[PDB]
């Protein structure tokens, strides 16, 4: 019992973090095999950030200008290239601690763990979700760029995010491990405003199921609804529309609790329309949307 915002154990990713310096700029890099991945903006001065021409700024950089340090030992850089918004630094030593890994590009609503790093050193780990507006609400300070987001499937680490920037609103933007930004964001110190941060409906429903499994049942009502009726209310409350795919994904949770997906939708509809009335669900006073249906199953079943 109990339900917590839980991150994956970070050891496998801690073994991949290195420090990358280019001129006066120091940030984090991810060392997998003989390659170190990092944000390409490591080549910029805070002055270049206003309007950087990365191809041009890169011409003035050589392998010996990228200083890569793993622990207290320097790695030898034998090649460098730009792929989208990431730099790939070929080093002469394969990371001995390289876990089995994949590079995945996640969808909005997907959750992942972030290992916040500074100077190639891990400072903490927390759970995130890729917001429907393609931002993440992280906790990142100057120097945290190159910190990564990931999921673990037993012993295979799927890297899904690399931190690049903080928007003027304090929300965060980054890329997948091929250097493609999530959403419309660009690595430039310019006005970029995020779109509507809607609520991930399928995640809230998964979390309501977790609440029922853990004994918090007060919000369960005697109603049901339809996808169309529910979605009318969801739109009004800035919630993502729920599709039959989402209902299907919640099938296991529906089966384990005996609560039909549409009945849980009706409970959610009433929570939206009536509010919590000062009550809490799983110790929260707001509807949590950063647990996927897979996360709920994983936490309620004990997958290691």
Enter the tokens of residue 126. Answer: 């927390």
Distance between CA atoms of 249 and 246, rounded to whole angstroms? 5
**Interface map 284-303 toward a copy of itself (x if CB under 8 A):** xxx-----------xxxxxx
Rule CB under 6 A: is residue 25 a binding residue for ligand Q3U?
no
Rule CB under 8 A: is residue 171 a binding residue for a copy of itself?
yes
Task: Identify whether the C-beta of residue 188 lies closer than 8 Å to the C-beta of residue 51.
Answer: yes
Please calculate the CA angle 201-204-205 and round it to the nearest 5 degrees. Answer: 90
Rule CB under 6 A: is residue 164 a binding residue for ligand Q3U?
yes
Rule CB under 8 A: is residue 9 a binding residue for a copy of itself?
yes
Looking at beta carbons only, is 51 or 228 nearer to ligand Q3U?
51
Which 3 state secondary structure label does DSSP give 271? helix
Distance between CA atoms of 89 and 18, rounded to whole angstroms? 12
| Identified catalytic residue from 16, 22, 38, 41 | 41
Q: What are phi and psi of 284, to 5 degrees?
A: -115, 145
Which residues in the 141-160 window bind a copy of itself by CB under 8 A? 141, 143-144
Q: Which of 160, 163, 171, 164 is closest to 194 using CA atoms?
A: 171
Q: Which entry of ligand Q3U, a copy of itself, none binds 304, CB below 5 to 8 A by partner kind? A: a copy of itself
Rule CB under 6 A: is residue 165 a binding residue for ligand Q3U?
yes
The residues, ordered by sequence, that sit 6+ positions from 85 with a Cβ below 8 Å of its Cβ are 39, 40, 41, 164, 175, 179, 180, 181, 187
Rule CB under 6 A: is residue 142 a binding residue for ligand Q3U?
yes
Q: Which entry of a copy of itself, ligand Q3U, none binds 189, CB below 5 to 8 A by partner kind? A: ligand Q3U
Choice from 49, 57, 272, 297 touching ligand Q3U (CB under 6 A): 49
Choice from 71, 79, 124, 184 touching a copy of itself (CB under 8 A): 124
Distance between CA atoms of 212 and 287, rounded to whole angstroms? 14
For the question of residue 145 being annotated catalytic, the response is yes
Enter the tokens of residue 13. Answer: 């990713």
Size of the site for a copy of itself (CB under 8 A): 53
Choice from 13, 43, 115, 145 touching ligand Q3U (CB under 6 A): 145
Rule CB under 6 A: is residue 134 a binding residue for ligand Q3U?
no
The residues, ordered by sequence, that sit 6+ positions from 209 with a Cβ below 8 Å of its Cβ are 250, 253, 254, 256, 257, 259, 264, 293, 296
Strand ranges of the sheet holding 35-39, from the earlier edge strand across to the other edge: 73-75, 66-70, 17-22, 25-32, 35-39, 86-91, 77-83
Q: How far is the CB of 114 from a copy of itself (least distance, A)?
A: 8
Distance between CA atoms of 36 and 21, rounded to whole angstroms? 12
Q: How far is the CB of 230 from a copy of itself (least distance, A)?
A: 22
Rule CB under 8 A: is residue 1 a binding residue for a copy of itself?
yes
Choice from 41, 80, 88, 269 touching ligand Q3U (CB under 6 A): 41
Which residues are catalytically annotated?
Answer: 41, 145
Give the residues lining the site for a copy of itself (CB under 8 A). Answer: 1-12, 14-15, 115-119, 121-126, 137-141, 143-144, 166, 170-172, 214-215, 275-276, 278, 280, 283-286, 298-304
Give the residues lining the site for ligand Q3U (CB under 6 A). Answer: 1, 41, 49, 140-142, 144-145, 164-166, 187-189
């Amino acid at each position: 019992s109990g339900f917590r915002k839980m991150a994956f154990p970070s050891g496998k990713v801690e073994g991949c973090m290195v420090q990358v310096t280019c001129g006066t700029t120091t940030l984090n890099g991810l060392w997998l095999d003989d390659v170190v991945y990092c944000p390409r903006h490591v080549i910029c001065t805070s002055e270049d950030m206003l309007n950087p021409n990365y191809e041009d700024l890169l011409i003035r950089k050589s392998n010996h200008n990228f200083l890569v340090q793993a622990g207290n030992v320097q790695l030898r850089v034998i090649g460098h290239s730009m792929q989208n918004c990431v730099l790939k630094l070929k080093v002469d030593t394969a990371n001995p601690k390289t876990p089995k890994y994949k590079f995945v590009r996640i969808q909005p609503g997907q959750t992942f763990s972030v290992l916040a790093c500074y100077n190639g050193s891990p400072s903490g780990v927390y759970q995130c979700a890729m917001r429907p507006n393609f931002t993440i609400k992280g906790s990142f300070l100057n120097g945290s760029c190159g910190s990564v987001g990931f999921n673990i499937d037993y012993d295979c680490v799927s890297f899904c995010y690399m931190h690049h920037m903080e928007l003027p609103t304090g929300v965060h933007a980054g890329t997948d491990l091929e250097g493609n930004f999530y959403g419309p964001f660009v690595d430039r110190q310019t006005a970029q405003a995020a779109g509507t941060d809607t609520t991930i409906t399928v995640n809230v429903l998964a979390w309501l199921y977790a609440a029922v499994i853990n004994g918090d049942r007060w919000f369960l009502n005697r109603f049901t609804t339809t996808l169309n009726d529910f979605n009318l209310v969801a739109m009004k409350y800035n919630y993502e529309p729920l599709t039959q795919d989402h209902v299907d994904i919640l099938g296991p949770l529906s089966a384990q609790t005996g609560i039909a997906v549409l009945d849980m939708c009706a409970s959610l509809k009433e929570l939206l329309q009536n509010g919590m009335n000062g009550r809490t669900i799983l110790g929260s006073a707001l509807l949590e949307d950063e647990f996927t249906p897979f996360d709920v199953v994983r936490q309620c079943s004990g997958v290691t």
